[PDB]
């Protein structure tokens, strides 16, 4: 219909996307190891009309001619991969990361996913799985009658047996680090899969090459900060309201055209 209607429609869609990101951040306050999202916006096309820099006279130029812009579109969603605050759950099976590493688990399809959530359980077979039942590559199998599980700062998992004064080692919890952590593709279930923009999976022990340290009995809470989300909700509501007012103004203009 009219250019301004399309531009304001794009603005409304962008503000709705911002509100969607806000709601997703707010709904995941209690999720362990969750990273908040941010939307990036860019200008749409620019109708050229007059060429800026064209020759107006034999010795004068046209400064900053008539460029008419289209609406707005979101560029991309970026996460804030930073250290969330730790919470003590007093559980021997929960591990938290202090640096910038990921746990590698195996999906039922055989491909490997990566999760920062440390809420682990032990299945009927004794293998350390996550809350959803995925097997946390690699192995960490657990003996039958364990009394206590000790996971050190460098990923060494040990089991204290009865009548034995020395703990036995049953695995080695490793961490995977990526060149670009924001490029990992989120699939839900607190799981990230590899992409071509997330570099390559660098397997390493906790403490070397940058990989973080593991704390037993702690969980990494989400990094969502509420006050920013509330102020952004106010921003989104008011910007949406302004764009709806612009749509209404275009509607009244068109109606006045129709009456004549």
């Amino acid at each position: 219909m009219i250019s301004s209607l399309w531009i304001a429609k794009t603005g409304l869609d962008a503000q709705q996307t911002n509100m969607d990101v806000i709601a997703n951040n707010l709904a995941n306050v209690s999720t362990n190891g969750f990273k908040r999202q941010r939307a990036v916006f860019e200008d749409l096309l620019y109708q050229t009309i007059r060429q800026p820099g064209a020759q107006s006279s034999e010795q004068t130029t046209l400064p900053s001619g008539l460029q008419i812009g289209t609406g707005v579109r979101p560029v991309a969603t970026e996460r804030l991969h930073s250290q969330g605050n730790l919470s003590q759950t007093n559980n021997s099976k929960d591990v938290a990361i202090k640096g910038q590493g990921f746990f590698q688990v195996m999906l039922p399809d055989g491909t490997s996913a990566y999760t920062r959530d440390g809420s682990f359980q032990v299945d009927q077979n004794g293998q350390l799985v996550t809350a959803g039942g995925f097997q946390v590559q690699p192995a960490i199998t657990i003996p039958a009658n364990a009394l206590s599980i000790t996971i050190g700062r460098d990923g060494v998992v040990s089991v204290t047996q009865q009548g034995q004064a020395a703990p036995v080692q049953v695995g080695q919890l490793n961490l995977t680090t990526f060149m670009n952590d924001t490029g990992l593709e989120s699939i839900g279930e607190n799981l990230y899969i590899e992409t071509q923009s997330s570099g390559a999976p660098n397997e390493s022990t906790p403490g070397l090459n940058g990989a973080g340290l593991l704390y037993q009995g702690y969980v990494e809470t989400s990094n969502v900060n509420v006050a920013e989300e509330l102020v952004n909700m106010i921003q989104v509501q008011r910007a949406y309201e302004i764009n709806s007012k612009a749509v209404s103004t275009t509607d009244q203009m068109l109606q006045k055209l129709t009456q004549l």
Binding site: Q51, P52, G53, A54, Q55, E58
Partner: protein, 50 residues
């Protein structure tokens, strides 16, 4: 857009109604008296603005 460079200048002439006559194809041409005084081809006027 840095490549933008001038190529040519349109010829803009100045002529009143009493000097031009509409030829049979709709294009105006200089009348005889006016042509005899202003020459065969009209020189471009630098003051004309488009």
């Amino acid at each position: 857009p840095n490549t933008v460079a001038p190529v040519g200048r349109l010829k803009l002439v100045k002529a009143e109604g009493n000097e031009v006559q509409r030829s049979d194809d709709g294009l105006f041409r200089l009348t005889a008296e006016a042509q005899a005084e202003r020459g065969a081809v009209l020189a471009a006027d630098p003051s004309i603005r488009i």
